[PDB]
């Protein structure tokens, strides 16, 4: 079919924030400050275009992209990277940048993001609000 990711979502729980943020180079002060913040993230979808407003720890990162077109994404460390974000099936947005694989899956009201770097799996679970 054709699924809508639009919505505001509240982070419910996460695994491996500290380790993942550590591995990508985030300053230890930012890690301690943001690890327990369960904030609200927003997705605005218009057809193939997405606008992502993500609260990750103590920082809000806004990115936008068209699925299947080259985009420039701001990563959590502040570095910009060229990649392409893609839809898999109806309800997954997938992309890979540097050595990180990122999979965002929407099941009803629950959105689950998994970022994998080596054998570090950073996983966040959020619920529509």
Helix (H/G/I), strand (E/B), else coil: 69: coil
Cβ proximity of 22 and 30 under 8 Å: no
Could you tell me the sign of the dihedral formed by the alpha carbons of 96, 25, 61, 110, in that order? positive
Q: Resolution in A for the shown PDB structure? A: 1.9
Q: After which residues is the chain broken (C to N over 2.5 A)?
A: none
Nearest by Cα to 42 from 55, 29, 53, 31:
53
Helix (H/G/I), strand (E/B), else coil: 100: strand
Q: How far apart are CA 28 and CA 41, in angstroms?
A: 23
Q: How far apart are CA 40 and CA 31, in angstroms?
A: 18
Q: How far apart are CA 1 and CA 9, in angstroms?
A: 23
Technique used: X-ray
Cα angle: 75, vertex 103, 31; to 5 degrees: 40
How many other C-beta atoms lie within 10 A of the C-beta of residue 41?
21
Dihedral Cα 11, 15, 45, 94, nearest 10 deg: -170
Q: Which residues pair with 106 in a beta bridge?
A: 111
Q: How far apart are CA 97 and CA 110, in angstroms?
A: 24
Query: Would you kindly state where each structural domain of the chain is located, as residue ranges?
Result: 7-128
Nearest by Cα to 114 from 61, 106, 71:
106
The reply to whether CATH 2.40.128.20 applies to domain 7-128 is yes
Going by the DSSP 8-state scheme, the letter that residue 57 receives in this structure is T
Q: DSSP string covering 8-49, please?
A: EEEEEEEE-HHHHHHHHT--HHHHHHHTT---EEEEEEETTE
What's the count of helices (H) and strands (E) in the chain, helices before strands? Answer: 2, 11
């Amino acid at each position: 079919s054709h699924m809508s990711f639009s919505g505001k979502y509240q982070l419910q729980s996460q695994e491996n924030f500290e380790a993942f943020m550590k591995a990508i180079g985030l300053p230890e002060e930012l890690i301690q400050k943001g690890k327990d913040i369960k904030g609200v993230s927003e997705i605005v979808q218009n057809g193939k275009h997405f606008k992502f407003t993500i609260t990750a720890g103590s920082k809000v990162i806004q990115n936008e992209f068209t699925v299947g077109e080259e985009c420039e994404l701001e990563t959590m460390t502040g570095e910009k990277v060229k990649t392409v974000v893609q839809l898999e099936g109806d309800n997954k947005l997938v992309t890979t940048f540097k050595n990180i694989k990122s999979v965002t899956e929407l099941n009803g009201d629950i959105i689950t993001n998994t970022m994998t770097l080596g054998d570090i799996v950073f996983k966040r679970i959020s619920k529509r609000i």
